Amino acid sequence: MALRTVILEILMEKEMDNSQRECIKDILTKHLVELSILARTFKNTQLPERAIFQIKQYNSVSCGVSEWQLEEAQVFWAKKEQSLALSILKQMIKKLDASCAANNPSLKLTYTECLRVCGNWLAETCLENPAVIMQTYLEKAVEVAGNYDGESSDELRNGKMKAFLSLARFSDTQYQRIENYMKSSEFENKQALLKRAKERYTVKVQRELELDELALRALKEDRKRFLCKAVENYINCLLSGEEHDMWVFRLCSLWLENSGVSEVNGMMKRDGMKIPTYKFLPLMYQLAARMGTKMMGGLGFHEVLNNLISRISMDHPHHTLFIILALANANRDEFDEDRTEAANRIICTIRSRRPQMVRSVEALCDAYIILANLDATQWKTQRKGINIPADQPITKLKNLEDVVVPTMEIKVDHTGEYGNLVTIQSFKAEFRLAGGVNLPKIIDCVGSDGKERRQLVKGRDDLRQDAVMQQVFQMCNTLLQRNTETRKRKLTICTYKVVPLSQRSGVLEWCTGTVPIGEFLVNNEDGAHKRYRPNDFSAFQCQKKMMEVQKKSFEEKYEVFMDVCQNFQPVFRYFCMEKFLDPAIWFEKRLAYTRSVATSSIVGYILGLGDRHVQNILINEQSAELVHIDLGVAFEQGKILPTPETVPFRLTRDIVDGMGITGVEGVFRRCCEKTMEVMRNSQETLLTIVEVLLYDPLFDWTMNPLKALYLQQRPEDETEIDQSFNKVAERVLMRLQEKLKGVEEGTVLSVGGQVNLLIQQAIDPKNLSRLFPGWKAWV
C-alpha cells in the first residue's frame, strides 16, 4: 500500500505534459479508490480515511461523474457515525437520473449500485414507514427489469449477478415480513379466538375479518410473485454462478411447506426449473433426502411436483440419479407413504427410458444391495472367536467377487461434467471382523487402479436415522467456504464417506486406522505403564462410582472424585505424554489436531454434541482430525436423560492432553470467539436449515421425543403428539436465539464472556459429577 501510494504521488507530480495524462490521473484516482476498498476489506479506521483525504486533495475537485457518494462511503463504515448523507445519496440519484438519464453511457452499473446501496441502507434502518420502502422497492425492480441485459457492460454476467442480489434482497425482505405476519398473525388469531367468544360486527370484527381475508390473498399473491422471481434468479444463476443455494433451499422448503396451494405458481416454478448439471448436483444433494420426506399425494399437485423433480434430476444422472435410487430403495422387506412408494416407482420407470445405462445400473444396484443384505444376515448368525476369517461360503463369495460391473457409488468428488469413471471390478475375501453389537467386516474394496476402500458392512440396525449428519457436515463445509478467515486459519471439518443402504443395513468406512481410545488405554495400563491403575481396578472403581451415584446421596461424591483424580491423573497424563514420538514435522500437527478438537467442540456447542464412548471417540493416524460418530444426542436429548443434566459435554482430559498451560486456553478462546463472530452473520440460513431438519417425524432419534425417546433407548445402551413436536421446535428456535446475538438471561454477553462461561461450566465439578458414571470414569 505504501509503495503504491508513493507511485501514485510520483505519477501525480510527473504527469503535467500530455492531454491523456489527465485521464491517466483519473485512473490514478480510481486506483486510490481501489486501495480504499482494500482498506475497507481490511476493516481499518485511519489509512482509508487518509486515502479519502488524499483523494479529496487531489484532482477529485473537478467532479466529472461525481460517484464519490458511492466510492467514499466510509463516512458511515469507517466513521461509525451513520445516517448522514442518505438524503444526499437520494438527491445525487435523482439529479443523475434527470439530466444524465438522456445521455446514459455504457456504465449503467452505477445506477444498479446506487439502488443496491439504497436498499441496504433502508434494510439497515428498518424504522421508516413501509409505504416509502415499497415505493423504493418497486422503483428498483422496474429499473432492473428495464435496464438488465441491455447495453454491453458485462451485464450478462455482472449485471445479472447484481439483479440476482437485488431480487434476493427483495425476496428475503418479503419472506421476513411474511414469517412475521404468519407467526404474530397466529398469535393474533389466538387473541381473536379469545375475544370473539362473546358470540361480524362492522366496528372491529368485520373489519378484522376483511383485513384477514384481503391480507391473506395479497400475501399469497406477493409470495407467489417473489417465489417466481427467486426461482428465475436461482435458475439464471445456476447458469451464471453459485452463492444462491441458501435462498434456493429456503424457497424450496417454503414451497414444500405450502404445498397444495398456488397450483399455477407451482406449475410455473416447475416449468422454469432449468439449471445446469453442476448446480443441480448441489440441489440433488438435498433432493436425495427430499424424495423421502413427508410429501404424500397422488391426486393433488404432489404427483406433478414429483414428476418435475424427477425431470429436473435428469441431468447429471451418473451419480445424482444413482444416489436418489439408493435412497428410494429402502422400503423393501424382501426376504404409510404408499403414495410416495408409487411416486418413486414412477420416477424410476421414467428415468429408465435412457437405454444407455439406467436399466442395467438399477438392476446391478438392487443385485448388490440384496447381496450385501444377504451377506450380513447370513454372517451375523454364526459365532467364532476373536478373529473370524474365512467368509467364503456365503453368497458365492460376493457372486464371484462382483465381476466387472459399474461401481464407485460414492464418488465424493461430485461434478456435473461426468466422463471417465473408476471401477471396483476386483475384490478380496476372508475379512476379519471388528467390535460392536453386530459382526461388521473389514472389507477392502480394491479398485481397478488399486484404490482399496476399507468398508464396514453392517445390518439389522437403524443407520439411516442419523444419515443427515453428512448433509449437515456438507452445509458446514459450504459455510466455511463462504467464510473468508476460515481458509486463512486452515479450518477443516471431519467428513464421512459412508452411504447407508436402508434402516436395516449400512456400510461404514474407515479412513486410516481409526483406533479408539478405550482399548488403547487398556493396553497402556497392561503393558506400557503400571504402579497406579490397571484395567480391572479402573473397572472396579467405575462400578463403585456407579453404585454410589445409584444408592448414596450427592454428598461424599466430590471427595471421592477428587481422590480418584489426584491418584489416577498421571496415568493418562503420561499415557498421552508417551505418544510424543513426534518428529520435527509434528510441531504443526500438535496445533492441527488441537484445532480440530476445537472445531469439534464448536460444532458441539452449536448443534448439541452427542455421545462420547470408546467406540465413539476415534483417533486418526495422520489426518490431523478426530472423527467421532456421536449420532446419539440432539439439542434437547441431554434433558430426556434419567436425572437430566445441563452440561456442555467437554472433557478436561483431552484439553490437558493437548495443552493445559502457557495461555493455550486463551489462544483457543480467541480462536473460538473469532469463529463464532464470523459464523454469527447467517442467522436466517441457520434457522431455515434447523426448521428443515426438525420437520422429519420419521427420524424420531433426534429432536423427536416419543415416550421419552423410548425410555432413553434403554438408557445409555443397557445401564452404561404434534404438540410435542411444535413445543420442541419453538424451544429449539428460542435456544438458538439464546446462542447467537443473545443468551438465556437476555443480556448480550459477547462471545468472549459466553465462551468463558461455557468453559467454566465444563470445568466445574458439578457438571462432570452429575452426568453419568461412564463419563465420570472418562474424567
From Swiss-Prot:
* Reported impact of R460H: Found in a patient with early-onset breast cancer; uncertain significance
Where is the stretch described as G-loop?
Answer: 433-439
Q: What is the effect of changing G436A?
A: In T-prolymphocytic leukemia and B-cell chronic lymphocytic leukemia
Q: Where is this region: Activation loop?
A: 628-652
Result after altering I133F: In a renal clear cell carcinoma sample; somatic mutation
**Effect after changing F575L:** In AT; decreased protein abundance
Outcome of mutating D366Q:
In AT; requires 2 nucleotide substitutions
Q: In which tissues is it expressed?
A: Found in pancreas, kidney, skeletal muscle, liver, lung, placenta, brain, heart, spleen, thymus, testis, ovary, small intestine, colon and leukocytes.
Span of domain PI3K/PI4K catalytic: 427-721
Question: What effect is documented for mutating R573H?
Answer: Found in a patient with familial pancreatic cancer; uncertain significance
Outcome of mutating A288P: Found in a patient with familial pancreatic cancer; uncertain significance
Family, per entry: Belongs to the PI3/PI4-kinase family. ATM subfamily.
Cite the domain annotation text. The FATC domain is required for interaction with KAT5.
Name used for this protein in its record: Serine-protein kinase ATM
